[PDB]
């Protein structure tokens, strides 16, 4: 039951940060100290959002 | 000549001590308050949330230490005048040791207050008032640190 709301907010947070990364935004990438490689990190964060959605389905199926 | 290579040493030590001494004061305060709370709330669980107040408004001392540390370190410089370093050291010592005194007072006052409130609840307001007057000490230390560091770059040559 604990994983429910955690994944609930995690899906949204991962999706929005992934969109910002994929849009090549100044506040996240562009700086030398930043990882750069926007598409790669965006794809990884897409995968993280997908797995959190998987946990959502798995936990909510118990209801 | 007014800018020795060792000038940033005083500023660095001031910035360090501003969080060190405040952290020790807040740590003793939180330790004494927490042992008091968990020694009293065993016999009265439900008043836990109200008895937590010593811990919070003792950790305010560490908050003061952190904010002084940041507002001092953001005045550190490679070519800072010996005077800037000394003023930063003075502000750091002021806030750190004032917070240490405040932590001592808050810790043992909160311990006494939680022991008292374990019996009857009207002591809550009184222990608040006393420990407010204890935390105002770290407040004054914050004041002194702020004004010293504000002057620290007034007319530096």
């Amino acid at each position: 039951w604990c994983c429910t709301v955690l994944s609930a907010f995690g899906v949204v947070i991962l999706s929005v940060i992934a969109h910002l990364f994929n849009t090549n935004h100044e506040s996240f990438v562009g700086s030398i100290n930043d990882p750069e490689d926007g598409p790669a990190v965006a794809h990884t964060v897409y995968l993280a959002a997908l797995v959190y959605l998987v946990f959502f389905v798995f936990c909510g199926f118990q209801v | 000549e007014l800018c020795p290579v060792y000038a940033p040493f005083f500023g660095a030590i001031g910035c360090a001590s501003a969080i060190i001494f405040t952290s020790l004061g807040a740590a003793y305060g939180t330790a004494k308050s927490g042992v008091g709370i968990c020694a009293t709330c065993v016999l009265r669980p439900d008043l836990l949330f109200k008895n937590i107040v010593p811990v919070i408004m003792a950790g305010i001392i560490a908050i003061y230490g952190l904010v002084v540390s940041v507002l001092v370190c953001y005045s550190l410089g490679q070519k800072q005048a010996l005077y800037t370093g000394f003023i930063q050291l003075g502000a750091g010592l002021s806030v750190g040791l004032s917070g240490l005194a405040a932590g001592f007072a808050i810790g043992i006052v909160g311990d006494a207050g939680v022991r008292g409130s374990s019996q009857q609840p009207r002591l809550f307001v009184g222990m608040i008032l006393i420990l407010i007057f204890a935390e105002v000490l770290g407040l004054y230390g914050l004041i002194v640190a702020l004004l010293l560091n504000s002057r620290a770059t007034q007319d530096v040559v």
Binding site: H25, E26 | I60, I63, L66, V67, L71, L139, L142
Partner: protein, 293 residues
């Protein structure tokens, strides 16, 4: 804290709005505020479910404070809109008013020119810069001091209304006007000169911006010792209202105990009031402190 004895003016009414906004000022963030507001909202819609069940030692105080945290989270929405950080990350909804140079050297120090102004909140160009923290310290300093002073004025006008509801003809003259004049002449003057300092374009006007705390305190040290006056006739204002503040003390000490037997209470009340006013005005800086924390 205590029980409001009778048909005076209490503090319970202004609390419903001052409490959440002070917390938000000390807490401003869309992220954490959003989590706490969702917690409150999920504790509000299921109210009927919770009315018929015991919250328990996890949600006892939360159940008692079931509605406070809701408006609390709304004011957190506001403060995060102004303190533009979301989980300490700044949003880009509004175009920045400050433009970087067209050719920034990789690794070299880069300056910014104020080519515009940000509608609401701090300009997002401030995010991730060395001078940002200082700018934020100064801005909060002043924000916290103004908010705390205005809270003091609001409470002291509550004292005015309390006194005026009864006859209290001796009480008002003895306590309100002298204390109000002292409090204004010092801290409201500080606030208004802060606001004027913001209003005037010091960089564009050529005049250097005077040290705020020096302009505060050289009054108490030596009137007229002004490095750069805020406005014309500034030193005359200094000496005038400083004399006014000084004569507030005999006013606050003498007129109320007249018939005194209650002079012992009056003198401790006067000294307690003045030191307590300066103490609270100082304590208003820890809104800044929590904000930075």
């Amino acid at each position: 804290y205590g029980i409001a004895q009778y048909r005076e003016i209490n503090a319970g009414l202004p609390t419903i709005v001052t409490f959440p906004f002070m917390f938000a000022i000390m807490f401003g963030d869309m992220g954490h505020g959003f989590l706490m507001t969702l917690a409150a909202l999920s504790l509000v819609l299921n109210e009927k479910k919770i009315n018929k069940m015991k919250r328990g030692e996890i949600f006892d105080m939360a159940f008692t404070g079931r509605y406070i945290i809701l408006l609390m989270g709304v004011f957190s929405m506001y403060t995060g809109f102004l303190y533009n950080d979301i989980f300490s990350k700044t949003m880009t909804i509004f175009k920045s008013g400050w433009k970087w140079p067209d050719h920034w050297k990789k690794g070299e120090s880069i300056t910014a020119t104020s080519v515009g102004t940000y509608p609401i909140g701090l300009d997002w160009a401030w995010h991730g810069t060395e001078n940002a923290l200082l700018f934020s310290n100064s801005y909060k300093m002043k924000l916290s001091i103004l908010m705390g002073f205005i809270h003091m004025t609001y409470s002291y006008f509550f004292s005015l209304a309390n006194h005026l509801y009864f006859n209290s003809m001796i009480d008002i003259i003895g306590n309100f006007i002298p204390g109000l004049l002292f409090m204004q002449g010092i801290f409201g003057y500080l606030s208004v000169c802060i606001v004027y300092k913001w209003a005037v374009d010091w960089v564009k006007d050529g005049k250097p911006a005077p040290g705020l705390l020096n302009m505060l305190i050289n009054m108490f040290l030596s009137p007229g010792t002004i490095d750069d006056e805020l406005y014309p006739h500034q030193a005359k204002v200094q000496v005038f209202l400083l004399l006014m503040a000084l004569v507030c003390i005999p006013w606050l000490l003498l007129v109320k105990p007249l018939h005194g037997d209650i002079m012992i209470h009056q003198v401790i009340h006067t000294i307690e009031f003045c030191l307590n006013c300066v103490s609270h005005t100082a304590s208003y800086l820890r809104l800044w402190a929590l904000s930075l924390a």
